[PDB]
Design a protein around this motif. Structure first.
Motif, PDB file in Angstrom:
ATOM      1  N   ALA A   1       0.808  -1.206   0.000  1.00  0.00           N
ATOM      2  CA  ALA A   1       0.000   0.000   0.000  1.00  0.00           C
ATOM      3  C   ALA A   1       0.843   1.258   0.000  1.00  0.00           C
ATOM      4  CB  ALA A   1      -0.927   0.003   1.212  1.00  0.00           C
ATOM      5  N   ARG A   2       2.156   1.124   0.112  1.00  0.00           N
ATOM      6  CA  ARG A   2       3.045   2.266   0.073  1.00  0.00           C
ATOM      7  C   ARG A   2       3.490   2.602  -1.337  1.00  0.00           C
ATOM      8  NH1 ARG A   2       3.766  -0.632   4.597  1.00  0.00           N
ATOM      9  NH2 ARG A   2       5.213  -2.065   3.556  1.00  0.00           N
ATOM     10  N   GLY A   3       3.879   1.608  -2.125  1.00  0.00           N
ATOM     11  CA  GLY A   3       4.463   1.898  -3.427  1.00  0.00           C
ATOM     12  C   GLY A   3       5.767   2.648  -3.308  1.00  0.00           C
ATOM     13  N   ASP A   4       6.538   2.345  -2.271  1.00  0.00           N
ATOM     14  CA  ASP A   4       7.635   3.215  -1.846  1.00  0.00           C
ATOM     15  C   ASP A   4       8.834   3.045  -2.776  1.00  0.00           C
ATOM     16  OD1 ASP A   4       9.064   5.022  -0.401  1.00  0.00           O
ATOM     17  OD2 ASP A   4       9.057   3.887   1.474  1.00  0.00           O
ATOM     18  N   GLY A   5       9.376   1.834  -2.843  1.00  0.00           N
ATOM     19  CA  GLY A   5      10.473   1.536  -3.732  1.00  0.00           C
ATOM     20  C   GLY A   5      10.011   1.511  -5.170  1.00  0.00           C
ATOM     21  N   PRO A   6      10.856   1.969  -6.088  1.00  0.00           N
ATOM     22  CA  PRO A   6      10.431   2.082  -7.487  1.00  0.00           C
ATOM     23  C   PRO A   6      10.278   0.758  -8.216  1.00  0.00           C
ATOM     24  CG  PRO A   6      12.133   3.676  -6.988  1.00  0.00           C
ATOM     25  CD  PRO A   6      12.090   2.724  -5.834  1.00  0.00           C
ATOM     26  N   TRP A   7       9.318  -0.048  -7.780  1.00  0.00           N
ATOM     27  CA  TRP A   7       8.818  -1.182  -8.541  1.00  0.00           C
ATOM     28  C   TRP A   7       7.374  -0.958  -8.961  1.00  0.00           C
ATOM     29  CZ3 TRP A   7      10.951  -5.489  -4.886  1.00  0.00           C
ATOM     30  CH2 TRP A   7      12.306  -5.663  -5.168  1.00  0.00           C
ATOM     31  N   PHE A   8       6.509  -0.670  -7.999  1.00  0.00           N
ATOM     32  CA  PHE A   8       5.107  -0.389  -8.239  1.00  0.00           C
ATOM     33  C   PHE A   8       4.851   1.073  -8.528  1.00  0.00           C
ATOM     34  CE2 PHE A   8       3.384  -4.236  -5.669  1.00  0.00           C
ATOM     35  CZ  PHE A   8       3.661  -5.051  -6.744  1.00  0.00           C
ATOM     36  N   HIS A   9       5.826   1.787  -9.069  1.00  0.00           N
ATOM     37  CA  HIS A   9       5.711   3.229  -9.203  1.00  0.00           C
ATOM     38  C   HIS A   9       5.002   3.577 -10.505  1.00  0.00           C
ATOM     39  CE1 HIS A   9       7.046   7.447  -9.612  1.00  0.00           C
ATOM     40  NE2 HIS A   9       7.087   7.419  -8.293  1.00  0.00           N
ATOM     41  N   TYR A  10       3.785   4.104 -10.390  1.00  0.00           N
ATOM     42  CA  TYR A  10       2.928   4.468 -11.511  1.00  0.00           C
ATOM     43  C   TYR A  10       2.985   5.966 -11.741  1.00  0.00           C
ATOM     44  CZ  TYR A  10       0.985  -0.201 -11.109  1.00  0.00           C
ATOM     45  OH  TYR A  10       0.808  -1.558 -11.053  1.00  0.00           O
ATOM     46  N   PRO A  11       3.078   6.419 -12.986  1.00  0.00           N
ATOM     47  CA  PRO A  11       3.183   7.857 -13.243  1.00  0.00           C
ATOM     48  C   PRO A  11       1.836   8.543 -13.095  1.00  0.00           C
ATOM     49  CG  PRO A  11       3.131   6.675 -15.296  1.00  0.00           C
ATOM     50  CD  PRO A  11       3.160   5.629 -14.224  1.00  0.00           C
ATOM     51  N   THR A  12       1.878   9.829 -12.744  1.00  0.00           N
ATOM     52  CA  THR A  12       0.633  10.578 -12.669  1.00  0.00           C
ATOM     53  C   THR A  12       0.564  11.681 -13.712  1.00  0.00           C
ATOM     54  OG1 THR A  12       0.598  10.212 -10.280  1.00  0.00           O
ATOM     55  CG2 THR A  12      -0.862  11.907 -11.154  1.00  0.00           C
ATOM     56  N   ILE A  13       1.432  12.679 -13.559  1.00  0.00           N
ATOM     57  CA  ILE A  13       1.393  13.924 -14.316  1.00  0.00           C
ATOM     58  C   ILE A  13       2.681  14.667 -13.970  1.00  0.00           C
ATOM     59  CG2 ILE A  13       0.165  15.277 -12.581  1.00  0.00           C
ATOM     60  CD1 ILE A  13      -0.542  15.254 -16.367  1.00  0.00           C
ATOM     61  N   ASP A  14       3.132  15.567 -14.833  1.00  0.00           N
ATOM     62  CA  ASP A  14       4.341  16.340 -14.577  1.00  0.00           C
ATOM     63  C   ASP A  14       3.959  17.783 -14.288  1.00  0.00           C
ATOM     64  N   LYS A  15       4.321  18.273 -13.102  1.00  0.00           N
ATOM     65  CA  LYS A  15       3.978  19.641 -12.735  1.00  0.00           C
ATOM     66  C   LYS A  15       4.991  20.661 -13.234  1.00  0.00           C
ATOM     67  CE  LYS A  15       6.089  19.917  -8.101  1.00  0.00           C
ATOM     68  NZ  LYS A  15       5.782  20.157  -6.663  1.00  0.00           N
ATOM     69  N   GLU A  16       5.931  20.256 -14.086  1.00  0.00           N
ATOM     70  CA  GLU A  16       6.863  21.220 -14.656  1.00  0.00           C
ATOM     71  C   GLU A  16       6.192  22.065 -15.730  1.00  0.00           C
ATOM     72  N   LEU A  17       5.235  21.490 -16.456  1.00  0.00           N
ATOM     73  CA  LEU A  17       4.634  22.168 -17.597  1.00  0.00           C
ATOM     74  C   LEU A  17       3.503  23.116 -17.215  1.00  0.00           C
ATOM     75  CD1 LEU A  17       1.703  20.498 -18.629  1.00  0.00           C
ATOM     76  CD2 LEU A  17       3.457  18.792 -19.055  1.00  0.00           C
ATOM     77  N   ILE A  18       3.287  23.362 -15.922  1.00  0.00           N
ATOM     78  CA  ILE A  18       2.268  24.312 -15.497  1.00  0.00           C
ATOM     79  C   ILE A  18       2.750  25.735 -15.790  1.00  0.00           C
ATOM     80  CG2 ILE A  18       2.956  24.848 -13.124  1.00  0.00           C
ATOM     81  CD1 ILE A  18      -0.479  23.635 -14.267  1.00  0.00           C
ATOM     82  N   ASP A  19       1.816  26.680 -15.783  1.00  0.00           N
ATOM     83  CA  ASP A  19       2.125  28.072 -16.075  1.00  0.00           C
ATOM     84  C   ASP A  19       1.849  28.922 -14.848  1.00  0.00           C
ATOM     85  N   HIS A  20       2.587  30.020 -14.717  1.00  0.00           N
ATOM     86  CA  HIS A  20       2.448  30.938 -13.598  1.00  0.00           C
ATOM     87  C   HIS A  20       2.273  32.379 -14.046  1.00  0.00           C
ATOM     88  CE1 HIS A  20       3.442  27.824 -10.671  1.00  0.00           C
ATOM     89  NE2 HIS A  20       4.446  27.469 -11.451  1.00  0.00           N
ATOM     90  N   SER A  21       2.066  32.606 -15.341  1.00  0.00           N
ATOM     91  CA  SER A  21       1.862  33.946 -15.859  1.00  0.00           C
ATOM     92  C   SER A  21       0.538  34.512 -15.347  1.00  0.00           C
ATOM     93  CB  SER A  21       1.868  33.923 -17.385  1.00  0.00           C
ATOM     94  OG  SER A  21       3.134  33.522 -17.876  1.00  0.00           O
ATOM     95  N   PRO A  22       0.448  35.831 -15.171  1.00  0.00           N
ATOM     96  CA  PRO A  22      -0.816  36.427 -14.721  1.00  0.00           C
ATOM     97  C   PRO A  22      -1.884  36.392 -15.801  1.00  0.00           C
ATOM     98  CG  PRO A  22       0.815  38.120 -15.147  1.00  0.00           C
ATOM     99  CD  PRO A  22       1.536  36.823 -15.226  1.00  0.00           C
ATOM    100  N   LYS A  23      -2.550  35.243 -15.912  1.00  0.00           N
ATOM    101  CA  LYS A  23      -3.494  35.001 -16.992  1.00  0.00           C
ATOM    102  C   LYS A  23      -4.732  35.871 -16.835  1.00  0.00           C
ATOM    103  CE  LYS A  23      -2.010  30.176 -17.430  1.00  0.00           C
ATOM    104  NZ  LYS A  23      -1.215  30.317 -18.678  1.00  0.00           N
ATOM    105  N   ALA A  24      -5.185  36.445 -17.949  1.00  0.00           N
ATOM    106  CA  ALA A  24      -6.136  37.556 -17.955  1.00  0.00           C
ATOM    107  C   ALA A  24      -7.543  37.073 -17.626  1.00  0.00           C
ATOM    108  CB  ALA A  24      -6.112  38.264 -19.303  1.00  0.00           C
ATOM    109  N   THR A  25      -7.767  36.734 -16.357  1.00  0.00           N
ATOM    110  CA  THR A  25      -9.075  36.613 -15.748  1.00  0.00           C
ATOM    111  C   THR A  25      -8.798  36.773 -14.264  1.00  0.00           C
ATOM    112  N   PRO A  26      -9.379  37.781 -13.610  1.00  0.00           N
ATOM    113  CA  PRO A  26      -9.016  38.050 -12.212  1.00  0.00           C
ATOM    114  C   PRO A  26      -9.512  37.000 -11.250  1.00  0.00           C
ATOM    115  CG  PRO A  26      -9.827  40.018 -13.279  1.00  0.00           C
ATOM    116  CD  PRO A  26     -10.155  38.886 -14.189  1.00  0.00           C
ATOM    117  N   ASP A  27     -10.556  36.267 -11.606  1.00  0.00           N
ATOM    118  CA  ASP A  27     -11.083  35.202 -10.765  1.00  0.00           C
ATOM    119  C   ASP A  27     -11.129  33.936 -11.606  1.00  0.00           C
ATOM    120  OD1 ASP A  27     -11.384  36.979  -8.642  1.00  0.00           O
ATOM    121  OD2 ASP A  27     -13.432  37.497  -9.224  1.00  0.00           O
ATOM    122  N   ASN A  28     -10.066  33.142 -11.540  1.00  0.00           N
ATOM    123  CA  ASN A  28     -10.002  31.891 -12.279  1.00  0.00           C
ATOM    124  C   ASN A  28     -10.584  30.726 -11.488  1.00  0.00           C
ATOM    125  OD1 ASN A  28      -7.976  31.925 -10.382  1.00  0.00           O
ATOM    126  ND2 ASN A  28      -6.325  31.369 -11.795  1.00  0.00           N
TER     127      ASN A  28
END
Ligand SMILES: CCCCCCCCCCCCCCCCCC(=O)OC[C@H](COP(=O)([O-])OCC(O)COP(=O)([O-])OC[C@@H](COC(=O)CCCCCCCCCCCCCCCCC)OC(=O)CCCCCCCCCCCCCCCCC)OC(=O)CCCCCCCCCCCCCCCCC
Ligand SMILES: CCCCCCCCCCCCCCCCCC(=O)OC[C@H](COP(=O)([O-])OCC[N+](C)(C)C)OC(=O)CCCCCCCCCCCCCCCCC
Ligand SMILES: CCCCCCCCCCCCCCCCCC(=O)OC[C@H](COP(=O)([O-])OCC[N+](C)(C)C)OC(=O)CCCCCCCCCCCCCCCCC
Ligand SMILES: CCCCCCCCCCCCCCCCCC(=O)OC[C@H](COP(=O)(O)OCCN)OC(=O)CCCCCCCCCCCCCCCCC
Ligand SMILES: CCCCCCCCCCCCCCCCCC(=O)OC[C@H](COP(=O)(O)OCCN)OC(=O)CCCCCCCCCCCCCCCCC
Lengths: 96, 344, 53, 38, 71, 458, 113, 49, 138
Positions: free
Chosen positions: E44-71
């Motif tokens: 139930a841990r998945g600790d050691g990299p055998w049962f390690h399943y990928p999710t998503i990469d948070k590197e490709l997120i954006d932080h620019s002030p996107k033009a909507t004040p309430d997103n």
């Protein structure tokens, strides 16, 4: 809302008894092209209210293959009538 | 005609790369869409009215099996909107996923896709090209793997060899005898896929090799089992000894290397305290051997070479990559302590 | 099997059009843009088998 | 007489000597790359 | 007399050969209980990299002030 | 085996490498030379134990059994040449090479160091036997008998893999029989029945019970050139000995369900020899003798506690030499009269006087005339199962009665006369016909002097 | 398990390498030695000692490729045990120390016949 | 000729006996035993390894 | 579904011989519909009111088997010695199989319906008796 149940009820224009049967096979290829617009619309209702801004190019590309797909399938349905003159799905020679 | 025959043939394997090189469900839709577009000419080449009435039985079976996949994408478009190829976040989607894709690989339901095409295509030459379409969706079930219901993937696979076995004892046409036992060798690999999804690919790479070398042996004249008699004393008696060796290898006998998968695949199926599951299937592939014995009882016992016709000339076909196939498809059982550490 | 060529050599074949908060050509977000960026922050180095629970 | 094609006869004799010398130089390097690393 | 030392050994070779190839086994048959301790039961841990399943990469997120004040 | 397999594979690129008809003399010459080397390092001492080299040999320490496996390739080539010499040399080179290829796997079998090395070599046969059954027989019922030889042996042996892989990841690893010092016992359950039963039933299919013997008078009846794999198939039957390796340990305490294997194989013993006295095919007469006093070991293994292993080992190579020669007596005297019908061969004992001794000294080993290797074997089994229950002397005694009337019925059918026919049958049992009929009794009565070589641990 | 999509990664330097005169590398290509003899036998050669230039380059093929294949096989077990022993090293609660008890503690069955 | 077909093939015995010796020279784990089996002080239990 | 077994395997355990065979004819009755649906589809069109598949007697057969299949057990569960046993539940095999033996006449089917059904009968309750699990995970 109810705008998704109709239309998810309208996805059952496959219904497989009438996806290859009965004869006049043009009646079956009909609902193969008519099974689109139950995917072209069901995608378009979801990309558009939830402003994705980018995935709405995908409903444009959804037609472009399924038109070219069905056009290929319509080429062969001449070849079954080029040898006969009638499509008539109760033609069967190569057993299984 | 000659150059455009490559460009059709080249894009078949270019269709299946995009299936593997993708992080996005739209591109895996395009991937084996255009395969269903670029197989239809190869069915045709000599224009015989069974072939035209066979590819059209091939066609719409892989139009709907395409079409339910795009239905399975747009359901979990509504749920959380991620389109990476991963777990599908909805049991109403994954159920519609796996038994849609079970038509392209055809399992035991979705039945007659396999015999009704492969029989009677006048291109028996190959039609080795029906190993790509067993290879594209297996590259899709490697990712979807931790989201299934574990009952459907076994019930399509327990029925797989029980009905791919019985189906061909009632046959003569050796294309059907190759079309059968091609559902059976799709039964051993997807019975294992929930438990350690590698040591599935071991069964597949073996299955490409042993089946590809079977068709190349068949390309002298061979059409029917009675024609498989009349080439021992006529064409080459070394062909009769070779066609014995691969069949007895493909039955799974431990002096040869078709026993290499099972021997390893039960190391994974038990170790998971599941014992009544392999004992059913391991005793089921036994009457998958009564194809091969009673086929070897034709060619290897001089059964009536009559109708005296002499082939006083040599043979010039192209038996490409044939000299190295029954030297890795038979003799490899000692030489693989770890093939499952290269492929892992 | 998932070869993943596009991680070795740095072209994006697709990738951009995959999640709800990626690029936005003139920076107009979605209706749930605030929860996409928050939820992807949760499971990054987590191996997704403990992320479900 | 003998009549081969005389074109490729030697390419098989020239590929191995290309392959073996590429192998042994890759081996005689990597035999030292253990101790160079360990 | 001239058969033994001319051909084979006595209890100094085939004794303590069974001490030698029974210390290749006690470090084989004890690790196969520890693979199946860790591999089969990570869990139930998945600790050691055998049962390690990928999710998503948070590197490709954006932080620019996107033009909507309430997103 | 350091290198016994390594010279006997070097026999194989010698046959095709040779000239013309020299291929018979070149193979039989070198094949006899292993019999010194086979004896040479083996038969050493001896008190717990001889682990031999590595993961490839425990030297077949307490059960020798392997010197007899190496006589035969220089015993069958002199036997097979009677009606083989009409085919091509390209196939005559084949039939010698697969026969050597059968001896290769038997050599790493019987020693095998493991239990999973055993099985893959236990099943590494049955491919070169089946080639000798289907090709190179006589008229039909080869092909169904080629399938009855499978599907009993292979249906049973696949639940070994389910149980042997089950042990390998339950208690340590099975890889050594000497890592079998730690053994947990096996109690009475509903899953431990099947662990015992699946591990046992694949050995019953080769050394038969009274049931499932239905393949044994199929392959031996319709049979190659002159008993040529039939000599091999009698060793292979007693080469399913591995129940001695397994059941001594590895569920040691299940005698609770031995009883449907006792009574089936103890009453079947008294009947399956009785069902042969009305045989009309001569090679099927011997084929049921091989059922009966082979199945005496099955009530000698399951009953434990030696004074039985004294005898159960001596019975494996009791008729290893006897039932081999009886097939050789019937592979001869068929080259001259072309039927195996026992009616037809009368008028004999005047025409061929020198082989009258070869009939009797064969059939005097089933009567078994106590100073042989035979009634030193049975009289340890008799004195063993007496101590199980006293009543077992009755059935086993009537076993001794009927086989006395059974063996002589094959002798006494040749003591008649006037021959009525037969302008053929001239050949006065040539030098080869007595040579390959010898080397059977010449070691058989020799070992009766000091038979301490033939004993278990025990 | 990191550094994805390599045939064999950079970190395989400290592995022995698997040098030659190992019997697998003799056996890899021995089947190729058998394969080149088949290559004549298919075509009615009728030599069985035919053109050596076809009978060579099979030996060169398997041995080179099989060597370059085995460098990752010994890597993958080396990376297998490397990650197991670390998870053995952390979490001692999943790995207890058993007590050493001789044969003065056990009263086993006892079942004689 | 000189007949390598003949007795040169039983000369594979010592060729096989060469490989027979190479295992026990790396199976040299224990000089430490207690049942004669000593390797106590002497050059007796060292030799023949 | 699986909850039918969670009302089969849970409450009665030998006793209450009416609700035992009321629920155990539901499952075997339901499988007569499954063999009916392919016998009108994989077999060609029958008479005017499909499913009228060729010989009939399909759901007529299947529900009759599960009607007695608790009843042969739950009578013989309590009357002998009051556990449920592998030899107890063995009895429901043969005469439970002989419904297919009674119709479509015997002497070649019926005893073979008796024999093999008795093999697969006792192993089921033997399964939870040892804790057997067919479709498992680590
Ligand atoms: C002019 C001629 C030129 C000169 C000739 C030389 C002069 C004559 C030679 C002198 C006498 C030697 C003859 C040997 C036989 C008698 C020996 C004896 O009685 O004392 C035992 C005597 C014991 O010596 P010991 O010092 O008292 O004790 C040592 C042992 O510990 C004792 O214990 P053990 O370990 O020996 O165990 C006992 C047992 C154990 O031995 C055996 O059982 C082995 C036999 C079965 C082998 C089975 C395995 C096969 C697989 O031995 C026996 O079997 C005795 C039976 C007779 C010998 C068997 C012959 C083997 C064949 O000798 C032997 O046991 C060895 C016998 C070796 C046989 C040599 C072969 C001779 C062949 C001659 C042929 C002549 C033909 C003539 C033609 C005639 C025409 C009518
Ligand atoms: C290189 C890519 C540029 C795209 C051009 C695509 C073809 C455009 C048509 C070229 C017209 C040339 C007409 C005169 C050619 C001289 C006639 C001749 O000798 O035949 C040569 C011909 C030119 O083709 P063709 O069109 O003139 O007539 C050939 C007849 N068919 C079409 C039935 C094959 O060359 C060939 O046949 C080989 C090419 C195969 C078919 C072309 C598709 C693949 C193109 C190559 C990749
Ligand atoms: C741009 C891509 C071009 C290559 C496309 C190749 C077409 C697909 C061929 C399918 C053949 C089936 C082979 C499947 C097993 C792959 C072989 C292998 O184990 O080496 C992969 C190796 C090891 O892969 P890996 O360890 O880096 O990660 C991938 C692991 N799998 C495949 C299980 C997902 O990859 C290479 O470096 C290729 C050399
Ligand atoms: C020596 C080689 C055989 C003798 C010369 C070749 C004669 C021949 O052409 O027969 C090939 C024979 C195939 O048998 P078959 O086809 O039935 O016979 C009719 C042939 N026109 O048999 C064959 O040779 C086919 C090739 C089989 C595989 C090679 C075995 C041939 C033995 C030579 C190689 C020895 C080294 C490899 C084996 C080492 C074993 C340790
Ligand atoms: C008949 C089929 C019935 C087999 C039922 C399976 C028996 C079983 O469940 O295995 C029991 C046991 C391991 O199973 P388990 O209960 O999970 O162990 C506890 C784990 N903590 O222990 C085992 O591993 C036993 C596994 C080997 C037995 C499997 C083979 C049994 C069937 C062979 C019968 C004999 C041959 C008959 C078939 C040939 C003729 C067709």
């Amino acid at each position: 809302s109810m705008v998704y149940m109709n239309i998810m009820m309208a996805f059952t224009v496959s219904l497989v008894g009438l996806l290859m049967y009965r004869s006049h096979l043009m009646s079956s290829l009909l609902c193969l092209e008519g099974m689109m617009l139950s995917l072209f619309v069901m995608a378009a209702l979801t990309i558009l209210n939830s402003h994705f801004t980018l995935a709405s190019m995908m409903p444009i590309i959804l037609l472009v293959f399924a038109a070219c797909e069905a056009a290929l399938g319509l080429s062969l349905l001449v070849m079954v009538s080029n040898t006969y003159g009638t499509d008539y799905v109760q033609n069967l020679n190569l057993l299984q | 005609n000659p150059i455009i025959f490559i460009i059709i043939l080249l894009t078949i394997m270019l269709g299946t790369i995009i299936v593997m090189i993708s992080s996005h469900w739209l591109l895996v839709w395009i991937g084996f869409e255009m395969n269903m577009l670029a197989i239809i000419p190869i069915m045709m080449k000599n224009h015989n009215p069974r072939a035209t009435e066979a590819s059209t039985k091939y066609f719409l079976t892989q139009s709907t099996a395409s079409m339910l996949l795009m239905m399975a994408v747009i359901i979990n478009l509504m749920f959380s909107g991620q389109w990476t190829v991963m777990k599908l976040f909805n049991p109403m989607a994954s159920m519609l996923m796996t038994m849609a894709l079970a038509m392209k690989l055809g399992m035991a339901p979705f039945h007659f896709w396999v015999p009704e095409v492969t029989q009677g295509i006048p291109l028996s030459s190959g039609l080795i090209l029906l190993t790509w379409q067993k290879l594209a969706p297996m590259s899709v079930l490697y990712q979807i793997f931790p989201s299934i219901n574990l009952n459907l993937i076994l019930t399509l696979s327990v029925l797989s060899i029980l009905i791919g076995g019985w189906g061909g004892l009632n046959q003569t046409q050796l294309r059907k005898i190759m079309a059968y036992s091609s559902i059976a060798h799709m039964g051993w690999m997807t019975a294992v896929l929930p438990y350690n999804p590698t040591m599935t690919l071991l069964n597949l790479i073996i299955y490409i090799i042993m089946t590809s070398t079977m068709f190349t042996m068949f390309m002298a004249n061979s059409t029917t089992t009675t024609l498989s008699l009349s080439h021992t004393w006529n064409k080459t008696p070394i062909m009769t000894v070779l066609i014995l060796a691969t069949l007895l290898s493909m039955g799974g006998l431990p002096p040869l290397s078709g026993f290499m998968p099972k021997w390893m695949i039960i190391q994974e199926m038990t170790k998971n305290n599941s014992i009544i599951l392999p004992t059913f299937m391991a005793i089921t592939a036994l009457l998958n051997l009564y194809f091969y014995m009673r086929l070897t009882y034709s060619t290897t016992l001089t059964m009536f070479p009559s109708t005296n016709n002499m082939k006083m000339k040599w043979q010039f076909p192209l038996m490409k990559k044939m000299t190295f196939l029954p030297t890795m498809v038979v003799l490899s059982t000692m030489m693989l302590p770890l093939t499952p550490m290269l492929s892992v | 099997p998932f070869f993943d060529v596009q991680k070795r050599l740095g072209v994006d074949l697709d990738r951009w059009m995959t999640i709800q908060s990626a690029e936005q050509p003139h920076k107009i977000p979605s209706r749930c843009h605030a929860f996409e960026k928050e939820w992807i922050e949760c499971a990054h180095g987590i191996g997704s088998i403990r992320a479900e629970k | 007489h003998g009549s081969p094609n005389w074109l490729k006869v030697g390419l098989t004799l020239g590929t191995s000597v290309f392959l073996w010398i590429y192998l042994i130089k890759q081996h005689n390097e990597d035999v030292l790359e253990y101790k160079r690393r360990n | 007399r001239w058969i033994a030392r001319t051909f084979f050994d006595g209890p100094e070779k085939n004794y303590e050969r069974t001490m030698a190839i029974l210390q290749i086994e006690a470090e084989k048959a004890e690790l196969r209980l520890k693979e199946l301790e860790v591999r089969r039961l990570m869990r139930a841990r998945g600790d050691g990299p055998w049962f390690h399943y990928p999710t998503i990469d948070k590197e490709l997120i954006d932080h620019s002030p996107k033009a909507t004040p309430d997103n | 085996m350091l290198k016994y397999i390594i010279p006997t594979i070097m026999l194989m690129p010698l046959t095709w490498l040779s000239k013309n008809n020299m291929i018979w003399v070149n193979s039989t010459a070198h094949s006899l030379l292993i019999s010194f080397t086979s004896l040479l390092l083996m038969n050493q001492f001896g008190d717990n134990s001889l682990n031999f080299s590595l993961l490839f040999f425990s030297d077949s320490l307490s059960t020798p059994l392997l010197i007899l496996t190496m006589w035969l390739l220089p015993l069958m080539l002199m036997a097979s040449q009677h009606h083989l010499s009409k085919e091509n040399l390209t196939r005559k080179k084949l039939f010698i090479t697969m026969l050597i290829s059968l001896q290769l796997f038997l050599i790493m079998t019987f020693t095998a160091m493991e239990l999973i090395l055993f099985y893959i070599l236990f099943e590494a046969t049955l491919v070169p036997t089946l080639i000798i059954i289907t090709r190179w027989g006589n008229q039909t019922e080869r092909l169904n008998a080629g399938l009855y030889f499978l599907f009993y042996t292979l249906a049973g042996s696949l639940p070994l893999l389910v149980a042997l892989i089950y042990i390998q990841n339950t208690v340590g690893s099975l890889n050594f029989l000497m890592l079998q010092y730690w053994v947990q016992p096996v109690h009475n359950s509903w899953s431990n029945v099947f662990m015992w039963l699946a591990c046992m039933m694949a050995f019953m299919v080769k050394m038969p019970l009274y049931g499932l013997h239905l393949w044994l008078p199929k392959a031996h009846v319709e049979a190659p050139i002159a008993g040529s794999m039939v000599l091999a198939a009698v060793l292979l039957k007693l080469g399913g000995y591995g129940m001695l390796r397994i059941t001594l340990i590895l569920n040691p305490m299940t005698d609770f369900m031995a009883y449907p294997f006792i009574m089936l194989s103890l009453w079947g013993m008294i009947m399956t020899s009785s069902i042969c006295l009305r045989q009309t095919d001569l090679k099927s007469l011997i084929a049921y003798s091989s059922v009966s006093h082979m199945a005496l070991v099955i009530v000698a293994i399951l009953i434990q506690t030696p004074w039985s292993y004294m005898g159960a080992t001596a019975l494996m190579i009791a008729h290893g030499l006897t039932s081999s020669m009886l097939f050789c007596l019937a592979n001869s005297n068929y080259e001259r009269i072309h039927s195996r019908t026992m009616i037809l061969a009368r008028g004999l004992q005047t025409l061929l006087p020198l082989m009258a001794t070869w009939w009797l000294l064969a059939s005097l080993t089933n009567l078994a005339l106590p100073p042989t290797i035979n009634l030193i074997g049975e009289l340890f089994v008799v004195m063993s199962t007496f101590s199980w229950s006293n009543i077992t002397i009755i059935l086993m005694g009537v076993n001794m009665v009927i086989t006395a009337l059974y063996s002589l019925y094959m002798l006494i059918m040749t003591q008649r006369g006037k021959y009525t026919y037969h302008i053929n049958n001239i050949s006065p049992s040539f030098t080869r016909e007595n040579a390959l009929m010898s080397l059977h009794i010449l070691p058989l009565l020799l070992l009766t002097l000091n038979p301490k070589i033939i004993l278990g641990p025990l | 398990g990191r550094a994805t999509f390599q045939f064999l990664p950079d970190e395989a330097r400290s592995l022995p390498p698997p040098k030659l005169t190992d019997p697998r590398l003799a056996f890899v290509g021995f089947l190729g030695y058998c394969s080149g003899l088949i290559d004549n036998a298919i075509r009615r050669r009728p030599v069985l000692l035919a053109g050596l230039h076809r009978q060579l380059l099979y030996i060169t093929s398997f041995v080179f490729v099989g060597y370059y294949l085995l460098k990752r096989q010994d890597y993958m077990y080396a990376v297998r045990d490397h990650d197991m022993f670390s998870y053995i090293k952390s979490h001692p609660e999943d790995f207890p120390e058993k007590d050493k008890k001789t044969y003065g503690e056990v009263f086993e069955e006892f079942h004689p016949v | 000729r000189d007949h390598w077909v003949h007795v040169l093939v039983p000369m594979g015995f010592v060729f096989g006996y060469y490989l027979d010796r190479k295992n026990d020279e790396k199976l040299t784990a224990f000089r430490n035993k207690s049942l004669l089996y000593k390797r106590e002080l002497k050059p007796n239990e060292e030799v023949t390894w | 579904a699986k909850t039918v077994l969670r009302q089969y395997w849970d409450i009665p355990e030998g006793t209450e011989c009416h609700r035992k065979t009321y629920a155990t004819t539901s499952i075997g009755g339901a499988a007569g519909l499954v063999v009916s649906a392919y016998s009108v589809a994989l077999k060609t069109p029958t008479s005017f009111l499909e499913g009228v598949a060729r010989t009939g007697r399909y759901t007529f057969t299947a529900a009759a088997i599960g009607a007695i299949f608790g009843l042969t057990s739950c009578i013989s569960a309590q009357v002998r010695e009051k556990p449920d046993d592998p030899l107890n539940y063995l009895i429901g095999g043969c005469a439970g199989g002989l419904i297919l033996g009674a119709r479509t006449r015997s002497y070649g089917i019926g005893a073979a319906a008796c024999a093999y059904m008795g093999l697969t009968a006792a192993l089921v309750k033997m399964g939870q008796l040892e804790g057997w699990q067919v479709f498992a995970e680590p």
